[PDB]
Design a protein around this nucleic acid. Structure first.
Ligand SMILES: [Zn+2]
Ligand SMILES: [Zn+2]
Lengths: 184, 116, 77, 295, 107, 49, 50, 162, 107
RNA sequence: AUAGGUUUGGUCCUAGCCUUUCUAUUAGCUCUUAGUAAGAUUACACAUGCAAGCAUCCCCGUUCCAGUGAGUUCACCCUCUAAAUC
């Protein structure tokens, strides 16, 4: 179950050698150009297809982020690009799993890849901006008056209230009421 | 086209999928389709929460100022969001709905107190 | 949507457009909040209009524009 | 006034500490490969090509600025109690613009308390990376900047690339950048692969951190083992400038020391393994006697 | 080229694809290659390589075994070389083909 | 007063362009009139159907 | 461009008919006072004016 | 092989490898050159090699070439203010003519970079439109944010299954 | 200013059979994009001349008009750049026939 | 195109047709779930239901959206400039 043992064991160098795993698979197709996709899976239900892919033909070959020699076998050596499924021979499912293993090993550190030297994001590196320093506080904020004092409820005189009632009587709704202050 | 009568409008344009709204702040004519010719896209507004959760929005404030100076008519969610920003005053409608919720929650607190 | 020559339906041949019931103080403070908000956004819009006009005027003819125009003419000659 | 990192004499001597190995600076990396071009010249044009390669190496080896940490900003612009309790999840506003600098743009947060707080440094960097993306930086913090990952990759001897990923992800004034850089410097002081950090743009920051927080014994050791003797004398000089109230410093200007004697004065005064510095110095002087007899 | 040992080239054939002329033309070209040492001995100057992978670092490959010529090469501006229209078509991007860059098997 | 983000904008840009000038940013309001919901318009700016 | 003479003629005579035979305010703003329905319009009046 | 003596003159990198970008004052460029005589060889090579590059980098300037009608080869430039620049090119080279016209009526490098900076001002990153114009189409792509429903299924907060 | 697209054009006179009008042939260079080669494309302009100074075969400079006069007359004569036969060399401002000096420049 | 098959008693050359690749519509046979994109062949005829109201009377809008591919160089740039928003 735990990988990194078969790859250093004896049966690997007996069946395969210094050659890669995929150096023996030839996909069967209508001749000339192969289809520009492999099968989606070799293992349908719990049965294997007639010509298994290099990953699917050996159940011992487990794939994860710690299986670094397989991962560097399935990624190129002179270029930092991953081998595609028509090039290698693995399924679409196995290609997705091998890719996820590649980037999981890449951000877990157990795989070699090139990182370019990056130029600094900005030119001026000062922190003397109003967005990255303090600001002179508002008069309301040094006090506690609400900003834009027309936000506060202020009851009109009942003369204006009765003028409103004279305008919009008949279909008049219920009465007034000041806001509470603190939510539950 | 020509659009006999009309004006520019800073508004939200839907660009998401089903059960996933996303809005783009654009400068479009009022008489054009919602997802159509905008003269320029001012920013972005995601109302959905992030994994951390912050409901994103970005505004190109100088070009917003430019199109307001050119005469763009703001739409009701748009002055809602600019008031929420602090580029515009807070909106009387939404502080009034805050007030309506004040009184509604006061009523349910009183009713629950009578229940208990 | 409909055009000017579409016949109206019967449920809109008769249908009353009943008015919302009006609350007094929310309505009055709502009018005051509306007039205050419209006044301050009118001020902000006037400021932005003046800013755009100033930008156009200084781009057309400021001091650096005349400076680069005279440099171009002198370099040409 | 104490000379900071960005001064002419310290920059020149730090350049000499770094050194220029062309075969390490311009090195074959595993990227996409294009067929190579071939050119046809004399010895003089070959020397001109090597000079241009040296100048390009200097451009590539221009030194990133070492800067102090930033104060965690907590500034409430406004607080709207009427807004408090209306919405649930916060709102981050960004002035994206195009010509404003990134440390000049304004980004604010509105919370369910009604507080219009200016955005923190981490939220600031995340929103700048979202709306103005730079290559290499991801807004989610990489899992490679965790203890076991950095340990494994230090064991795989990848410290230049630690500093590369850290430069790509974190701004130099950030606490995470500061912590990762000093943790890498502590690991390289524990084991020590200064040659693995030579001819790279982090050598000067490493030397600056060590002479500021004094652990330069291994630097003297590796310098006089690898015959970087003018380099070692200049490093003792940098120490004497940066700490002028040290007994190394008054002993040096009392004895008018100039070279290997400056190194000896330092090792007699404050070197924590000064017996081993003297032992390496006298073995080096035995080697000097050997090749002087050879000369 | 698996029999020879060559691993990385591109080859396009045209005209008549006859096997018995194809193989003989292949052998004629590969045996009438010029190497960098012979090139350097003919011109009298250094042979250098400039890779995009390494950078501006000049990598000397072949130096003359005799004297070094001291007059520089004549920089013939706008040279007279016969280009290929398929190469120029591919370089400028009007080579529209549904067959060229197809994902095939190994080698 | 100016809305708080714009207040931050303009006080920031003035202390970048030089003089501290810590007065509160005010703008003229009495220029704008206060015509309420009563004011009649013009019939030729209007028009009969 | 082949001219649109008949369209221009229709426009001109429509403008002339609108100018000459315009409906007047008497038959425009009349009110059937029991059902609040104006003639020639067919639309009644809003709830704030009954 | 491509037809012609020098096939490099039709390879779209020679054309966008010429250097003269004319100012907005000039409208007509006239090249009077001599087919014979050892002194007009620079003008002949300038007509042969550099006129396509000049026309490619200045698409709206009318370039007219004239044959053996005057005993000396010269360039004339007709400029919108009304100017008529004369540049004799007898006993010169094509590179000399290129440098001369780039100095006299060529736009400066700083002006070209400023124009290109205005184009990069037009190209903005933070906008979210289609891939033809912008860089990302939605924030369904940016990690952390809730993904697109097609790629990742949404939880049952969605409508219908409320 | 002018609503005419062509501000300054240099062309050749074809015919002078219209009163106070000259028919001028303007030849621009248009890139054939497949061959990537510049070929002359010709357009006929109608220029206004008040003095009947231009004969056929002349090389003329035409300026734009602020508003076109006729249906096609959108340009006016600016100068007779090269009169037929009697060609004054402008570099050495001397009369010449072609490739030779009718009057010697060392006069 | 990394090309392949096919003229002949046989070879070489020129040549056409076809194969190998990808996408779309329809037909046959056969089909488990979940999510998401997209969804008359016909500018042929349409039963029926709905799609334009608002609003203190005036106005405004129904001249927009939505649809279709019949026709077809009325779409782009410059000059001038009328509605329209400030
Ligand atoms: Zn498989
Ligand atoms: Zn999506």
């Amino acid at each position: 179950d735990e990988p990194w043992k078969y790859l250093e064991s004896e049966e690997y160098q007996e069946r395969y050698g210094s050659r890669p795993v995929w150096a023996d698979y030839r996909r069967n197709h209508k001749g000339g150009v192969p289809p520009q996709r492999t099968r989606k899976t070799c293992i349908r239900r719990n049965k294997v297809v007639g010509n298994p892919c290099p990953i699917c033909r050996d159940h011992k070959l487990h794939v994860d982020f710690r299986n670094v020699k397989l991962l560097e076998q399935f990624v190129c050596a002179h270029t930092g690009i991953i081998f595609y499924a028509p090039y290698t021979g693995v399924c679409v499912k196995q290609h997705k799993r091998l890719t996820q293993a590649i980037q999981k090993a890449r951000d877990h550190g157990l795989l070699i890849y090139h990182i370019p030297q990056v130029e600094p994001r900005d030119l001026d590196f000062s922190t003397s901006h109003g967005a990255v320093s303090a600001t002179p506080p508002a008069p309301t904020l040094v006090s506690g008056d609400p900003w834009y004092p027309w936000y506060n409820w202020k009851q009109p005189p009942e003369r204006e209230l009765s003028r409103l009632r004279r305008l919009y009587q008949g279909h008049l709704q219920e009465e007034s009421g000041p806001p509470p202050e603190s939510m539950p | 086209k020509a659009y006999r009568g009309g004006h520019l409008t800073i508004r939200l344009a839907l660009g998401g999928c089903t059960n996933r709204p996303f809005y783009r702040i654009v400068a479009a004519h009022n008489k054009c389709p919602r997802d159509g010719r905008f003269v320029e896209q001012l920013g972005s507004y995601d109302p959905l929460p992030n994994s951390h959760g912050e409901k994103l929005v970005a505004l190109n404030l100088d070009r917003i100022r430019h199109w307001i100076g050119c005469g763009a008519h703001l739409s009701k969610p748009m002055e809602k969001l600019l008031g929420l920003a602090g580029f515009f005053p807070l909106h009387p409608m939404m502080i009034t709905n805050a007030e309506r919720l004040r009184r509604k929650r006061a009523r349910e607190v009183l009713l629950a107190s009578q229940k208990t | 949507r409909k055009t000017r020559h579409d016949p109206l339906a019967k449920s809109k041949i008769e249908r009353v457009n009943m008015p919302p019931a009006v609350d007094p103080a929310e309505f009055f403070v709502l009018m005051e909040r509306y007039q205050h908000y419209r006044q301050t956004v009118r001020a902000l819009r006037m400021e932005f209009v003046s800013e755009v006009q100033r930008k156009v005027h200084e781009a057309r003819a400021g001091v650096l524009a005349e400076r680069k125009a005279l440099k171009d003419a002198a370099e040409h000659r | 006034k104490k000379p900071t990192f960005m001064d002419e004499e310290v920059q020149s001597i730090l350049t000499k500490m770094t050194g220029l190995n062309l075969q390490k600076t311009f090195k074959p990396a595993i990227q996409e490969l294009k067929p190579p071009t071939y050119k046809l010249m004399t010895q003089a044009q070959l020397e001109e090509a090597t000079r241009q390669a040296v100048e390009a190496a200097k451009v590539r080896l221009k030194m990133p600025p070492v800067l102090e940490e930033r104060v965690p900003i907590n500034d409430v612009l406004a607080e709207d109690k009427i807004l408090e309790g209306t919405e649930t999840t916060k709102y981050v506003f960004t002035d994206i613009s195009y010509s404003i600098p990134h440390r000049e743009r304004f980004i604010v947060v509105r919370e369910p308390s009604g507080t219009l707080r200016k955005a923190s440094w981490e939220e600031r960097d995340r929103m700048i990376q979202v709306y103005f993306p730079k290559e290499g930086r991801k807004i989610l913090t990489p899992i490679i900047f965790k203890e076991e990952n950095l340990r494994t990759m230090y064991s795989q001897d990848r410290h230049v690339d630690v500093l590369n990923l850290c430069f790509a992800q974190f701004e130099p004034d950030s606490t995470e950048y500061i912590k990762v850089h000093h943790k890498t410097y502590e690991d390289i002081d524990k084991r020590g692969k200064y040659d693995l950090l030579r001819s790279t743009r982090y050598f000067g920051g490493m030397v600056w951190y060590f002479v500021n927080n004094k652990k330069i014994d291994g630097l003297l050791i590796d310098q006089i083992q690898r015959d970087l003797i003018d380099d070692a004398t200049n490093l003792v000089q940098l120490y004497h400038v940066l700490h002028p109230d040290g007994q190394s410093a008054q002993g040096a200007k009392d004895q008018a020391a100039e070279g290997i004697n400056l190194i000896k004065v330092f090792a007699k005064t404050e070197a924590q393994k000064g017996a081993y510095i003297e032992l390496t110095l006298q073995t080096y002087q035995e080697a000097l006697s050997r090749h002087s007899a050879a000369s | 080229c698996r029999l020879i040992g060559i691993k990385d080239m591109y080859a396009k054939v045209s005209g008549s694809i006859n096997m018995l002329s194809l193989t003989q033309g292949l052998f004629r070209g590969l045996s009438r290659q010029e190497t960098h040492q012979q090139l350097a001995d003919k011109k009298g100057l250094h042979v250098v390589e400039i890779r995009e992978e390494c950078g501006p670092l000049p990598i000397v490959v072949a130096s003359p075994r005799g004297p070094l010529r001291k007059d520089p090469e004549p920089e013939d501006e706008v040279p007279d070389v016969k280009l290929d229209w398929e190469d120029v078509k591919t370089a400028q991007g009007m080579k529209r083909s549904v067959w060229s860059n197809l994902k095939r098997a190994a080698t | 007063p100016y809305p708080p983000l714009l207040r931050a904008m303009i006080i920031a840009e003035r202390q970048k362009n030089g003089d501290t000038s810590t007065e509160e940013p005010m703008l003229n309001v009495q220029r704008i009139r206060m015509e309420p919901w009563d004011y009649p318009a013009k019939q030729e700016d209007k028009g009969r159907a | 461009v082949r001219p649109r003479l008949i369209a221009e003629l229709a426009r001109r005579v429509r403008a002339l008919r609108e100018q000459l035979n315009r409906p007047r305010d008497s038959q425009l703003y009349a009110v059937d006072y029991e059902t609040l329905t104006r003639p020639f319009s067919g639309r009644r009046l809003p709830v704030r004016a009954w | 092989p491509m037809k012609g003596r020098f096939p490099i003159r039709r390879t779209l990198q020679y054309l966008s490898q010429g250097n003269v970008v004319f100012k907005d004052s000039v409208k007509v460029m006239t090249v009077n050159y001599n087919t014979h005589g050892e002194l007009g060889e620079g003008a002949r090579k300038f007509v042969f090699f550099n006129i396509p590059q000049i026309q490619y980098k200045n698409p709206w300037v009318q370039i007219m070439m004239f044959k053996n009608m005057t005993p000396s080869p010269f360039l004339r430039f007709y400029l919108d203010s009304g100017e008529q620049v004369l540049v004799d090119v007898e006993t010169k080279s094509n590179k000399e003519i290129m440098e001369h016209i780039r100095k006299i009526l060529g736009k400066n490098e700083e002006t070209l970079r400023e124009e290109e900076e205005e184009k990069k001002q037009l190209s903005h990153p933070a906008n979210f439109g289609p891939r033809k114009y912008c860089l990302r189409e939605c924030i369904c792509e940016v990690e952390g944010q809730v993904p697109c429903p097609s790629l990742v299924p949404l939880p049952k907060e969605m409508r219908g299954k409320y | 200013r002018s609503s005419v697209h062509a501000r300054w054009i240099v062309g050749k006179v074809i015919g002078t059979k219209m009163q106070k009008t000259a028919k001028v042939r303007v030849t621009r260079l248009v890139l054939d994009p497949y061959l990537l080669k510049y070929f002359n494309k010709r357009k006929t302009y109608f220029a206004h001349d008040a003095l009947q100074q231009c004969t056929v075969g002349d090389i003329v400079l035409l300026r734009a008009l602020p508003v076109p006069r006729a249906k096609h007359v959108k340009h006016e004569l600016a100068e007779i750049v090269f009169k037929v036969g009697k060609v004054i060399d402008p570099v050495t401002g001397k009369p010449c026939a072609g490739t030779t000096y009718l009057e010697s420049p060392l006069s």
